[PDB]
Design a protein around this nucleic acid. Structure first.
Ligand SMILES: [Cl-]
Ligand SMILES: [Mg+2]
Lengths: 276, 267
DNA sequence: CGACGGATCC
DNA sequence: GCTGATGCGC
DNA sequence: GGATCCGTCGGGCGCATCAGC
């Protein structure tokens, strides 16, 4: 069953007009993504803030195209120190953030290049590339430990400002969040353990799934599809990328989009509209 | 005999423009230096990389203004378990390590084209009580740096706690048995240059310039009298000399008993 | 990880 | 410098 | 005996490293 994201809704049902557009995209290799025209799609989307995951590209290797982005001139990049072809995240902002930080506690020694924190006037933005549990779940226990360290990190932000967490959280929360729930409950992304850790994230911090909060019963809405077996053509996918919002930000929430048609990766973009 | 640092030359000998600005500063107490508006000066200088020595501030007590520099958003710190160093970077380093392989004195940041080492070299101490420690530290340091420089071009910056030659301090005759001008320490610095090998960026460009210092004792108004020492260096692999645009001494920036130093590289 | 083969359920 | 093989994780 | 369940298997992608020339 294919899926068509509904039109963009740009006013917080309190009538206010959207003033902030954030796009998040796991690009599956930033240099590949750019050669497949990913940046052309970003220019059309014209977000205020762009968060990317799986850049897999040291900052010295960033294509020049990325420097002719005058609407996204404040750029922050993070790659792991042991694995230059894996992981890596980036945050690009029209306006300069008040503060930027990396990691979830000890990045100066555990240089993982998975998390960026950017503080703006009225909110704190986190973007994350959550560690994959691996084929055959070989890294599932590390993922569970990482999840708990992340929850405690987010909780323990010393800000009174509401939180926006976005990116590839690497779990389809509920059964509606992927096309084959049953044949996947022992696969990375849909174990009981990862689903539980997403559940605890929402409760402990606390946070709301912006998309599901708006479209609580809509099925077949995914953000990832394996390259194999033409899954994307058949919309056999998983919803792995999210905008999760502090409770206070919900009256500001105008919409949470899935940009199903944007190619260039095995994930598609997601976009948030906030009225601030 | 006062000193006016020449203006910044931001063009390489072969005409290529500076692409990399590195600033090193012994802040003599990180919290005090921030209170004395050190971060305001850094925001104006706007380096790509900032190296700090003598931070004397455990990680959990690092002031909050520091995260208010998104232009130096990658921040690395090494505490001694009087010491401590930091390395703040605009771009994400490829790799960052700590120490010299054997006190919170050294951070190593690996970049695309080069490796950056910042060092707070141990002072031989009043009464030379720690000269022997310093001598062992010097040798362990040279040996560690040769390994690094064998894999990539080397930039070494920071407070090396020695005035190499007589021109490098105001009172050479009265200090030939004091920390920072002993025969041993000067020998160690020459061994450092010859063994690795490295070039003294500032002395390479201004070989005949006297009265150029980066440290002055707080006492007896020495900074007002420019009674001081050139203790803070940028040393470079010979391979990088074609990229050298300038090596500056920021005599006027206050907040410490050392002043900042700034390197321009055309990479 | 979706497709596939094989077993099990009423 | 360049290509394609292999390794590894996604 | 159609629907469902469960375990196994082959593999599309990007990037690093290595060999060969
Ligand atoms: Cl960065
Ligand atoms: Mg991926």
């Amino acid at each position: 069953a294919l899926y068509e994201d509904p039109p963009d809704q740009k006013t917080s049902p309190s009538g206010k007009p959207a003033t902030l557009k954030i796009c998040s995209w796991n690009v599956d290799g930033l240099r590949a993504w750019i050669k497949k025209k990913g940046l052309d799609w970003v220019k059309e989307e014209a977000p205020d803030i762009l968060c990317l995951q799986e850049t897999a590209c040291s900052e010295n290797k960033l294509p020049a195209e990325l420097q002719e982005l005058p609407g996204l001139s404040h750029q922050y990049w993070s790659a792991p120190s042991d694995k230059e072809g894996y992981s890596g995240v980036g945050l690009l902002s029209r306006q300069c953030p008040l503060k930027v930080s990396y990691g979830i506690g000890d990045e100066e020694h555990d240089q993982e290049g998975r998390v960026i924190v950017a503080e703006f006037d009225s909110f704190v933005l986190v973007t994350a590339y959550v560690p994959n549990a691996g084929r055959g779940l070989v890294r599932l226990e590390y993922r569970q430990r990482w999840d708990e360290a992340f929850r405690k990190f987010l909780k323990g932000l010393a800000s009174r400002k509401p939180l926006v967490l976005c990116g590839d959280l690497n779990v389809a929360h509920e059964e509606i969040d992927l096309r084959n729930p049953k044949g996947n409950k022992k696969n990375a992304g849909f174990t009981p353990q990862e689903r539980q850790g997403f559940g605890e994230l929402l409760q402990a911090v606390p946070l709301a799934d912006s998309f599901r909060h708006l479209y609580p019963n809509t099925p077949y809405a995914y953000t990832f599809w394996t390259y194999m077996m033409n899954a994307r053509s058949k919309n056999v996918g998983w919803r792995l990328d999210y905008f999760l919002l502090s409770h206070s930000l919900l009256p500001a929430l105008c919409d949470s989009k899935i940009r199903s048609k944007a190619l260039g990766s095995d994930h598609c973009p997601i976009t948030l509209y906030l009225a601030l």
